Amino acid sequence: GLMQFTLPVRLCKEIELFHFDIGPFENMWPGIFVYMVHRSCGTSCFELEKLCRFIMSVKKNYRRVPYHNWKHAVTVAHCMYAILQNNHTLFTDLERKGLLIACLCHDLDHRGFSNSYLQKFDHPLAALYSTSTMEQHHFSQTVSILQLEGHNIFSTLSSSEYEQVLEIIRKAIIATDLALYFGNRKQLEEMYQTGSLNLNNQSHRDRVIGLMMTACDLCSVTKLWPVTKLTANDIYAEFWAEGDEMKKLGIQPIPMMDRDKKDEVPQGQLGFYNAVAIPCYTTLTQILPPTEPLLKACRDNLSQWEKVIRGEETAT
Numbered sequence: 001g002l003m004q005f006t007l008p009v010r011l012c013k014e015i016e017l018f019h020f021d022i023g024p025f026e027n028m029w030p031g032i033f034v035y036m037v038h039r040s041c042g043t044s045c046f047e048l049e050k051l052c053r054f055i056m057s058v059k060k061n062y063r064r065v066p067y068h069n070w071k072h073a074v075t076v077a078h079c080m081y082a083i084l085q086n087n088h089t090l091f092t093d094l095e096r097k098g099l100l101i102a103c104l105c106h107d108l109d110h111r112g113f114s115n116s117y118l119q120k121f122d123h124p125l126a127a128l129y130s131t132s133t134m135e136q137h138h139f140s141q142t143v144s145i146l147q148l149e150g151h152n153i154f155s156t157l158s159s160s161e162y163e164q165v166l167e168i169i170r171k172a173i174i175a176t177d178l179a180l181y182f183g184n185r186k187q188l189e190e191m192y193q194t195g196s197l198n199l200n201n202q203s204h205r206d207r208v209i210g211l212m213m214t215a216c217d218l219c220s221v222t223k224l225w226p227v228t229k230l231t232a233n234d235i236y237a238e239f240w241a242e243g244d245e246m247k248k249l250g251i252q253p254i255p256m257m258d259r260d261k262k263d264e265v266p267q268g269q270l271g272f273y274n275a276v277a278i279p280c281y282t283t284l285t286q287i288l289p290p291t292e293p294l295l296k297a298c299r300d301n302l303s304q305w306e307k308v309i310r311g312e313e314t315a316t
């Protein structure tokens, strides 16, 4: 275990920032992920050769879609790294291990379509899994990959530790279904405001980890403006392809998925920062005060979208 992963000077500094962008060199992202695992977990959490084989099989089962791709997996994992490193006294050995892996695996085999498009299309995944359809598919892909030869990165855990870390990963992946976020955040807001929240309660921990997953999964809204604006182009590239598919079934798409409604994107973003993102990072900051820079960069990008609405800025 005398093989440390090292990063160039600028990446070693800036990867500690919540707003870090992992860059356009795909062949560096496995190295970045391993480095974050060695520092947040430890060099002996996993055998390097199995982790590397795992990472490359995971990469292989992400698709060449505009947004829900391999670069999103690593980006979401980096946001979990920042949260873990700035809160290191609060999490267990098994939570460190499981959570970066859950983030890497959390959108495995995404085709760029929502749970609603699978219901309206009558995709077979919708018969198998009636709610959190894609998310139950992503967990199931995670299990397939763990069961490939030489891919059990959790080989040294007991039977009952292996079962807990898989349950951490299952719950974390299910939580990235944004339809569940609204309930989970309501519950955590009441629990914090009445002072009933208890990190020794497993059902409370599950809720906090879920919100952590929502925060990590939306983290595009918490990058510097040019990253935030450029990533919104890839998100809408997918939404509009899905709305096209909705039209082919003879169904009117909701406005965010209609490419004809392109000029209303700035007002849509504002709707989404006020109804989803700001509440998300506000609640997470109350629970984990050191996650502050996420909410701060969210508020900053809200102003940016407001400048776009008043013509002081453009977005093509």
Ligand SMILES: Cn1ncc(C(N)=O)c1C(=O)Nc1ccc2[nH]c(-c3cccc(Cl)c3)nc2c1
Residues within 6 Å of the ligand: 178, 217, 218, 219, 220, 221, 232, 235, 255, 256, 257, 261, 262, 263, 264, 265, 267, 268, 269, 271, 272
């Ligand atoms: C930035 N980011 N990061 C993660 C996600 C995510 N997974 O949702 C998003 C995101 O952009 N979501 C989003 C949600 C609701 C929207 N509603 C409109 C919208 C409404 C009315 C007219 C128009 Cl034209 C458009 N746009 C939306 C975008």
Ligand SMILES: [Mg+2]
Residues within 6 Å of the ligand: 106, 107, 134, 176, 177
């Ligand atoms: Mg997802």
Ligand SMILES: [Zn+2]
Residues within 6 Å of the ligand: 072, 076, 106, 107, 176, 217
């Ligand atoms: Zn995601």
